[PDB]
Amino acid sequence: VLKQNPFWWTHQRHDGKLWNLNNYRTDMIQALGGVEGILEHTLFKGTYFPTWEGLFWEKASGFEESMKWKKLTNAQRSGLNQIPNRRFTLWWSPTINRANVYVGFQVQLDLTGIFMHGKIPTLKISLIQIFRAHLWQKIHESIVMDLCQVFDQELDALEIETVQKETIHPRKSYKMNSSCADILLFASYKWNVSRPSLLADSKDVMDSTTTQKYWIDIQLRWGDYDSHDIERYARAKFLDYTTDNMSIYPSPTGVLIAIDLAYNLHSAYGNWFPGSKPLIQQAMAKIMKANPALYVLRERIRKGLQLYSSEPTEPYLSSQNYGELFSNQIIWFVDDTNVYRVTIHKTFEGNLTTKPINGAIFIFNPRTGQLFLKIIHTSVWAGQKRLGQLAKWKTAEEVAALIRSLPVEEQPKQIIVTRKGMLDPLEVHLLDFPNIVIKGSELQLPFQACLKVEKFGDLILKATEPQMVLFNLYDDWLKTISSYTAFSRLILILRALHVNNDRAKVILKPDKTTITEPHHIWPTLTDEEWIKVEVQLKDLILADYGKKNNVNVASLTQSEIRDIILGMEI
Amino acid sequence: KPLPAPLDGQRKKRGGRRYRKMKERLGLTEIRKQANRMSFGEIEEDAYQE
Amino acid sequence: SYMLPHLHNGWQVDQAILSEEDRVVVIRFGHDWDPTCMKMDEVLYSIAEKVKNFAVIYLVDITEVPDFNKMYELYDPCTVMFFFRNKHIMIDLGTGNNNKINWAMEDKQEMVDIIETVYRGARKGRGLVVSPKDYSTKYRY
Amino acid sequence: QRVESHFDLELRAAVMHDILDMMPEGIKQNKARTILQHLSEAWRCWKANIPWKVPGLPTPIENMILRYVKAKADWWTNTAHYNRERIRRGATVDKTVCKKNLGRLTRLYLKAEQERQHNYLKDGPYITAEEAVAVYTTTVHWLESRRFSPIPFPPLSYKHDTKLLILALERLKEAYSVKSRLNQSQREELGLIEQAYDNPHEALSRIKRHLLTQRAFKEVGIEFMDLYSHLVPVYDVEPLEKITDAYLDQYLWYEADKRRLFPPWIKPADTEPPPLLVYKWCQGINNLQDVWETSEGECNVMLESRFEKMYEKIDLTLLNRLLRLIVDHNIADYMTAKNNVVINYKDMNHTNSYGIIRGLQFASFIVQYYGLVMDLLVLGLHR
Amino acid sequence: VDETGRKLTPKEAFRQLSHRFHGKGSGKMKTERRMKKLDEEALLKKMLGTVALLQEKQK
Amino acid sequence: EVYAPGLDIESSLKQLAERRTDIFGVEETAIGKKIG
Amino acid sequence: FLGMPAPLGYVPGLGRGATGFTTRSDIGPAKDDEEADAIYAALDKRMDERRKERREQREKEEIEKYRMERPKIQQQFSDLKRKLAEVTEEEWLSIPEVGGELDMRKIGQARNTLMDMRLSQVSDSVSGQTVVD
RNA sequence: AGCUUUGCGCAGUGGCAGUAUCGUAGCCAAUGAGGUCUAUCCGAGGCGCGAUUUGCUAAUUGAAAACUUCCCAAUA
RNA sequence: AAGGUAAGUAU
RNA sequence: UUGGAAUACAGAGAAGAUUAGCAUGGCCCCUGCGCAAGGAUGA
């Protein structure tokens, strides 16, 4: 091998991992100050989501795939390789842009309020990407507009006569000193204000001063690993700005608010309106929770640092979904085994001919009032020496093709397929349609009814045509008044057919059985009379439950039987 | 044999089925399956498992 | 052996730089008899064949053309000014003077990458561009 | 960094000026530039160590070119070894400078090995007459005392024949399986490995056919890794030849272990890692009866050394004879023929006849066996 | 609150912010695409198999 | 071609020899010596 | 545009329309004056003449000593360039622009044959000698 | 008169179309390309080089994804 | 000392 | 619908991007059109 092998003393997986290095990671992380202590200087607090666990960090981004595919040049290769460095250096911005670290002349960006010590090209370029298009002015305008709207909404109890804003200079958003006041509020006659303090305080003596005006200032600041003390910063900034000749405030009484973007921490300091202090605290919390520009900045940070939001858990359960199936706008289910089903011959001496039957997946959609018959050629469905995994891979392409042909609105909003193993390739196929979603189906539709039914069994042979076919819904569903219970009536007969096809036909009423219409593959149902026939079909499952399971036939509850009919149990 | 001039990349004027066939034939479909995402929590492997 | 084109007259270099179209004009100021400048000229000669399509190298002598010595502060050997598109580009490579490369490149491939990055930046229209390899350190260790 | 560049520029400029003095630039202008081309050609003709003859050029011009190239080669070798000494001493060097020094050292070593092989061919094998015969007699007497059945040709039926192929496929895959990407040659090797894994019987039949029929191999490339104190060789062989040699080495190792063909005292043993080997060595030293009281009336000597002439000081006739005495003659002949192949480089190719390709998959077995030969010779039959 | 009064997504809110800030909105083609998307969403909220079933009824 | 013609190359080599007297001229005066 | 004359009457710096690359102050320069410069240069030369002769003599001696150890580059082929002009005119004109001792291996072959014969003869004593087929 | 064999170009469907293919102003040519099976021999080009049309339309990111008037005081 | 000039656009 | 207001500008890509589908072309099976042409049968 042209590369040096440090582990030439012994081979891995041959002499075993002699050195146990597991406690070292825990000892190092806890001795550094714990997980929270380490993350305190890593811009983690800059993301509102509490992704302490379950967060995904993208080691390789889409640009990496593009560079790998495009066969980039030397300079392009170096630029692509210099991506992770920029990534974690932005991720380590607080502890790497301190004041004690990298002493020298302070410098701020072109149009923002981030001070950087020492020119760091990676941090500089990352910051100007994150704060592109006057993002600081945009977030300042967003916060001032939110404050104005909140004050106007509750102007009754606050005795607010006028709530306006001055002709703020455009550069006064990121300025070091708030020379121009942000929000002015004039009351009717008088306004009692207490001594300046922080929002954590509780005591108040409004007789300290009486003024007819009030000012509110928003301080957009970027906290470092050592200057992230919002309360101390709020106090110092209020003292400096309020007591200064350069700063011009129309009113001597007011409160200055501060937002640490990197810390994402809200604070305020100064006087308060009578009874507005909890109101202002709640308003600041609510705005900082779902501010538009703040949310955009958080999304920009998440993308730039390649920290993907922790993936949500799909409702793999379907017991509630089965009851709410009619509530879903679009839903469909497809049986993976049906597409890969291969009829097998029988011979005493000759080898069994497990030839493929057809490419149809026996797809169904009770909420859509119809079914999908993705009929394909048997040879196309399963080629020579084709493994089950190969058939599943080809079925995924056809599964996405059916969604591609269908309109986005008509396409199933939730693809509830009980085949969890086949769900992931379907979910991977579902990535071609981001609008649509795929949810696990705890309830399993008895697709074996189509194989058991001769009419659909003949359709399975009739599905040998490579072209797609149209599978009409059962006439029993149309006959039933309730479309929500139409599937349940069909599933109850279908589930008994899967357990016992021959017994199901006897259990099913001949009047309901001989009610087949040209508009439906399966016959109709005589409303309540079918339920009596389906009771025997239910009794067939109950007889199976009574004989096999310890619980008697009568002991099998209808609620459990309905779940068993829909296959809710694993 | 002078090296080609690195002109700025020009995207396909119109994505064709034959162009899509080449994209189907050659692309990053298999690489996209392998997710490079890493959990924030520590993995069970050692520090330098490689 | 310093067979690259050389500007006998100062004004000739001016019009040669002016007579450019979709190409980068690397004017290497200095003297051929200098040893470090000889190494730089050898590196430029090696690069010239590979990147002649868009990169043209046109040497000049400070003694022959001293009028441009004070124009861009030409007071060091091996100086290189990527005067492209009739615009003196800002090539930043971790150095104080981000408009002048005044030392022979260690490897030819590095110079080729630098010149193609300069071409890309000039074609994009930006007057400044950074280098993939910072030269604040010589990687001596 | 200009001194070497300064001298190279001085050489080329002086030669060009001398040519322009001799060549009448007042009459002919273009061809002089083309003259420089031959210069470079001559230079690379010296670097590749390939013949360079240009009958079109005048004889005095050829003499001037020869003088230029001899001066350049002397200076180039001098600066190459000087920079190598600077790097190995501890002086700080740059990446490009280190790569250039490594390339120059590779070229110099390739040349040196070329005249070494030529000198071995002209002067003949250095194994003294009847001396290699005496060594072989001692070896065969020791083997007869051991009285072991020699390894035969690969039988049609084997206990775990497919297992050896699986292990060899895994070993070859481990070279670049974890790598993000593989070269075109590496891609072809991976495809060949996958094909061999898919059809074990066809691959085994092909390997046996190559063993019993094929005796001429392709050009194995030779690169050098710089450990900053020396250059260690790495050899890229043909993927089919590589897999056949891997299976051959695995089969030889299994058959030798199954018949105790190698004594335990050989230091590299799979049972104990090197540190365990050292500690067992110390415990065995302490286990001697007169290990430490000997200082009362005797002495103890501990000698550790290395055979400096192992790679490029062997005669393949003795290897042939010993291997035929230790294994089936066809397999031994194939192994020795693989040890006598053509070595390629960036622009230099030669033939190895005295040396042994360390990159051969079975080179470990032959090196261990020959070291056993020296061990038996030095230690003595009774000992 | 937008013109229709529906609760906008934060992306749409920031889009409105920037459009107000620069003093101008999107282009004509972008507006046509946006209104087409809005019409599609409205049509989807208000909700074709009946026609298919009626056609399949005939042999 | 990119490279200068033969006359320009000869002139450049003559200038280099005249300026750098270390390896050219009657005597080696200095690197930048006008007269060797 | 190499090989073209420069039209006089125009300043190359101003006509091209360039901007002063002020890299750093105190790094560039940025008749009575002529007479003063001459006087100051004369004073500097007078000051420097205190040690010029001995230093020049020592430098010349050192250079002469260095030349004997290793001469100039063109010195190693002065004879060659002296004999270079002996080539005919038609010789370099047709320069292509495109780019006794017996078989010493016989002794090695004889030695190898002798060694092989000796080994084959010694193989007789190998009772357990084996072959393949 | 019907019918059939076959190829080019065009028309239609189907099919493959990154071990898929043409381009060549290069090069060996039915006067014999090029063979390692057949060397009184097979008979087609050999193997380099240059690379993998045009048109419709969606969708995504971004503040803006480019088709020839704003705003202000009051009003008609 | 420094290794810390964003470029662009007409005035 | 009047009238006018309309250092500075803008700012890390805007020297308008990214991704994707269908048809055609080319290739080739079948068939058709145009068309060279021979072969035999029947009244």
Curated annotation (Swiss-Prot), chain A:
Region: RNase H homology domain, residue numbers: 321-570
Tissues/organs with expression: Widely expressed.
Stretch forming the signal peptide: none
Region entry Involved in interaction with pre-mRNA 5' splice site, spans: 223-570
Source domain of life: Eukaryota
UniProt-reported outcome of changing residue 342 to D: Strongly reduced interaction with RNA
Subcellular location: Nucleus; Nucleus speckle
Region (Restriction endonuclease homology domain): 135-306
Disease listed for this protein: Retinitis pigmentosa 13: A retinal dystrophy belonging to the group of pigmentary retinopathies. Retinitis pigmentosa is characterized by retinal pigment deposits visible on fundus examination and primary loss of rod photoreceptor cells followed by secondary loss of cone photoreceptors. Patients typically have night vision blindness and loss of midperipheral visual field. As their condition progresses, they lose their far peripheral visual field and eventually central vision as well.
Function statement: Plays a role in pre-mRNA splicing as core component of precatalytic, catalytic and postcatalytic spliceosomal complexes, both of the predominant U2-type spliceosome and the minor U12-type spliceosome. Functions as a scaffold that mediates the ordered assembly of spliceosomal proteins and snRNAs. Required for the assembly of the U4/U6-U5 tri-snRNP complex, a building block of the spliceosome. Functions as a scaffold that positions spliceosomal U2, U5 and U6 snRNAs at splice sites on pre-mRNA substrates, so that splicing can occur. Interacts with both the 5' and the 3' splice site.
Name of this protein: Pre-mRNA-processing-splicing factor 8
Annotated organism of origin: Homo sapiens
GN (gene name): PRPF8
From Swiss-Prot, chain C:
One GO term of the biological process aspect: RNA splicing, via transesterification reactions
Disulfide bond in keyword set: yes
Pfam families assigned to the protein according to its UniProt record, in alphabetical order: DIM1
InterPro entries documented for this protein: Dim1, Thioredoxin-like_sf
Description of post-translational modifications: The disulfide bond seen in structures determined by X-ray crystallography and NMR is not essential for protein folding and function.
Cellular localisation: Nucleus
UniProt-listed SMART domains: DIM1
Modified residues (Phosphoserine): 131
Cysteine-cysteine disulfides: 37-78
Origin: domain of life: Eukaryota
One GO cellular component, as annotated: nucleus
Record keywords, A-Z: Cell cycle, Cell division, Deafness, Disulfide bond, Mitosis, mRNA processing, mRNA splicing, Nucleus, Phosphoprotein, Spliceosome
Spans traversing the lipid bilayer: none
Function summary: Plays a role in pre-mRNA splicing as component of the U5 snRNP and U4/U6-U5 tri-snRNP complexes that are involved in spliceosome assembly, and as component of the precatalytic spliceosome (spliceosome B complex).
Matching PANTHER family: THIOREDOXIN-LIKE PROTEIN 4A (PTHR12052:SF5), THIOREDOXIN-LIKE PROTEN 4A, 4B (PTHR12052)
Record disease entry: Burn-McKeown syndrome: A disease characterized by choanal atresia, sensorineural deafness, cardiac defects, and typical craniofacial dysmorphism consisting of narrow palpebral fissures, coloboma of the lower eyelids, prominent nose with high nasal bridge, short philtrum, cleft lip and/or palate, and large and protruding ears. Intellectual development is normal.
Family listed: Belongs to the DIM1 family.
Protein name per UniProt: Thioredoxin-like protein 4A
From Swiss-Prot, chain E:
Disulfide bonds: none
Name of protein: U4/U6.U5 tri-snRNP-associated protein 1
Lineage: Eukaryota, Metazoa, Chordata, Craniata, Vertebrata
Tissue: Ubiquitously expressed.
Organism (species): Homo sapiens (Human)
Cross-link Glycyl lysine isopeptide (Lys-Gly) (interchain with G-Cter in SUMO2) per UniProt, renumbered positions: 11, 37, 46, 57
PTM notes: Sumoylated with SUMO2.
Chain's role: Plays a role in mRNA splicing as a component of the U4/U6-U5 tri-snRNP, one of the building blocks of the spliceosome. May also bind to DNA.
Assembly description: Identified in the spliceosome C complex. Component of the U4/U6-U5 tri-snRNP complex composed of the U4, U6 and U5 snRNAs and at least PRPF3, PRPF4, PRPF6, PRPF8, PRPF31, SNRNP200, TXNL4A, SNRNP40, DDX23, CD2BP2, PPIH, SNU13, EFTUD2, SART1 and USP39. Interacts with UBL5. Interacts with IVNS1ABP (via Kelch repeats).
Family per record: Belongs to the SNU66/SART1 family.
Record's subcellular location: Nucleus
UniProtKB/Swiss-Prot annotation, chain F:
Compartment list: Nucleus; Nucleus speckle
Residue spans crossing the bilayer: none
Annotated positions of the Phosphotyrosine modification: 3
Tissue: Ubiquitously expressed.
Assembly with partners or alone: Component of the 17S U2 SnRNP complex, a ribonucleoprotein complex that contains small nuclear RNA (snRNA) U2 and a number of specific proteins. Part of the SF3A subcomplex of the 17S U2 SnRNP complex which is composed of three subunits; SF3A3/SAP61, SF3A2/SAP62 and SF3A1/SAP114. SF3A associates with the splicing factor SF3B and a 12S RNA unit to form the mature 17S U2 small nuclear ribonucleoprotein complex (17S U2 snRNP). SF3A1 functions as a scaffold that interacts directly with both SF3A2 and SF3A3. Identified in the spliceosome 'E' complex, a precursor of the spliceosome 'A' complex.
Cited function: Component of the 17S U2 SnRNP complex of the spliceosome, a large ribonucleoprotein complex that removes introns from transcribed pre-mRNAs. The 17S U2 SnRNP complex (1) directly participates in early spliceosome assembly and (2) mediates recognition of the intron branch site during pre-mRNA splicing by promoting the selection of the pre-mRNA branch-site adenosine, the nucleophile for the first step of splicing.
Free-text note on domains in this protein's UniProt record: SURP motif 2 mediates direct binding to SF3A3.
Name of the protein this chain belongs to: Splicing factor 3A subunit 1
Organism whose genome encodes this protein: Homo sapiens (Human)
The gene coding this protein: SF3A1
Residues of the full protein shown: 454 to 489 of 793
